[PDB]
Amino acid sequence: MKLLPESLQQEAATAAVVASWVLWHLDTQLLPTIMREHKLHACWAAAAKRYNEKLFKLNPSY
Amino acid sequence: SSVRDVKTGSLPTNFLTGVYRFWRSQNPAEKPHDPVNDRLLPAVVDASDKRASIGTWATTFFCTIISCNLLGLMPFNEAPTSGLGFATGLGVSVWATATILGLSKTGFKFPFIFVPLETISYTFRAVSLGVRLWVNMLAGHTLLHILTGMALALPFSLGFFSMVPATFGVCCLLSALVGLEYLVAVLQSGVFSILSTVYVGEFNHDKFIGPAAKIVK
Amino acid sequence: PSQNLVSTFANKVIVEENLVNVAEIDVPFWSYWLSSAGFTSKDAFVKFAEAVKPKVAALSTSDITNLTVAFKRANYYDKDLFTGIEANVSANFTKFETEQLLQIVATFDAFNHSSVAFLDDVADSITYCNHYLAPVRAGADELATLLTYYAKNGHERADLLATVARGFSEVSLGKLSAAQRKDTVLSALKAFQTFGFYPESIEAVIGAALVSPAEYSAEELKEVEAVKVAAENALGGEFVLIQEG
């Protein structure tokens, strides 16, 4: 049993590579998709009242 | 150059949405004194520009650390986190990220014997953040290896199918230990990211460039 | 004998004609990067304009804003070309982003080129087709260029004015230098007085002239005070400055 590895810098660079890939994949592939779903639902839920009142005012059918 | 199609409402999308909203909620934005409207909206957008992305960073660290921590519990696999350089490199990385943010706020200027004592107390966060997670992963694997040898010894020196109650008891103890290792894997990933959020939120504070001139009524 | 050879190779192959002849494949790309590097010669852009002129109507939005910025830097105005660029912008105005439209409107404001349909499509694209915080990321000189463009052409669009008034604040005006901030404040206040539109964010313009009135002359201060009294009457109160606290 050894505490230290063969190279501390190699393991540190492995951690940096893995975490930087998780950062790029999060910011680039995951967070656009997440925010497309979330901001569609949130924009509709935040604008339902104003949207329906504006469309009710525009609608000449009544 | 063509991206893949995603089903809306997938379980990984929902899980990562909850995780991101959690680590984003750890450092909430401050309410301004003025009411938020179109006069205050560039001040709010610049406040969001000056705030560091601790939600993205904490989600990054949570996902990579829980992935390595759970890799330690798959068969034929050890955690990368149980290595010293990996886990303590992540810890020194979070401490240096918080320090680089706090230095850049102070104009890239480095910071009455209270100042070296607080310097050592702050600098020990670099040791503690990585050594905690690395020590927990190393201790759990080491404890399992020592415990497994004792359990193996019981049926090696008492017959394969000749000592049922003591072997059953020690395998119950080993199985409860592996369940504890699952709990410790999840907990140490969450602990690393919570302490990451508090260490960077010490320096996340910035000036709100609000309105300098207004119509009073 | 190599020096006579390199003198023969240096005056016949690496010339401006082969430079503008290799720049025919992707001409908004090449005109953009050659104009940024500093190559602003007139005859090359005369060649470049008839290079793009067929294929303008099917260009991308990034290539349209690249070509328009390049011809802004070369200062060469081709009426049929900018009619083609204006028809491209008016054709697929929903695809254009606000920063691209601000660069395009800056080029169309350097010359006096405008249609009613182009102005309505740019205002519709900035207001409705784009994010409402896109003027916040703009920089107040670009928005003041657009405001003076719409004021010069007399096109009144109150929704576009309410959109690009959002970009004027302490932040975006504080990003500018002092002479550029004075020019931007004068342009924005003149356009807002032309339209008769005084939003709640005009005071961040007016304050940017009144926190530092040392750079402003007496007639410019009279103009700023005229817009200040007009905005006081429109917004419904009196204009104070806020101190540090």
Add this chain to the structure above:
Amino acid sequence: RLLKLWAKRLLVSPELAIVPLNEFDAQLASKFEGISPKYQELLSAVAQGNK
């Protein structure tokens, strides 16, 4: 023309059949939030689909 005009509306959104015509003006109000809630949840739940 009236059958065609109602056919387009009942093809795009067939949930308009659950409001009788003679009661439609009895639902409205000056603000949209003041429209009578007798049919609103029924309109939304029928518009969500047959499943």
Add this chain to the structure above:
Amino acid sequence: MAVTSFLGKAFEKYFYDFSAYEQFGLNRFLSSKGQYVALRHVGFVMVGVNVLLAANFPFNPPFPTIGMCPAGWEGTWVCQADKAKALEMYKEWKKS
């Protein structure tokens, strides 16, 4: 004809339908289903360690014995604590 389709359907039928808590009628011996899951977990561990030890044996264990042998190797080449001595004793035991 396909292999992975039958493998998926067969593992589905084994995972969901095949239940030895009701097929063997273990509800009389055991209290609940979760107790059966815990005992099947620990029984899986016991059978696995016995198959590994039973698989390849007789060998000098790298794990610490508590001073107990397998009752057939008092001091041959399996209970030796020194490893080089156990190696040469294994060699003169393998020559036989």
Add this chain to the structure above:
Amino acid sequence: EGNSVAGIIKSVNETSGANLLSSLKTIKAQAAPIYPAAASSTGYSTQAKIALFGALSWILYRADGQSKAHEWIVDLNLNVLQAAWLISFSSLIPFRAVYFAFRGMAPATASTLNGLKTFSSISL
């Protein structure tokens, strides 16, 4: 691919009065969204076979290195102790409740879409 409502309008205006009630179902089925039917079941993907063969090669390589190791038998028994928990998690975890809990984690799936109402966008 044009507007489907514009196709509904053109197809309804193009019919005669005698043909309208007969053709309404076909005008409904023409401007209805494409839900693509299930294709023929094929082999596994290139990436799926790469993933399975790479996982098997990693498992074999790690089991080989665990065999070569000094405390080899406790390595191979740690694999049993971990596979036991992967077995017991398939029996313990309430996957329907876990699915709906994760659905509650995201606000996009926690609630229904509250958006356009019928009375606002009606056209009499």
Add this chain to the structure above:
Amino acid sequence: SVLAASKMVGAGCATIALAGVGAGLGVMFGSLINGAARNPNIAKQLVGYALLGFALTESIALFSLLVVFLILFA
């Protein structure tokens, strides 16, 4: 081998700090039970504090164990 003998003695004397950290951790978890009994409406908040508290408390154990490793396998 008096150095290795003192290594075993020093590691066995080194792990005494796990007693104090276990007593403190039990005090903190007993107070978590108490605080959930006082005000269960915020109980899922309190457990979070407990985990965070356990976090920092656990670190004092690991700086013990690290010294043990620095005694044993350095």
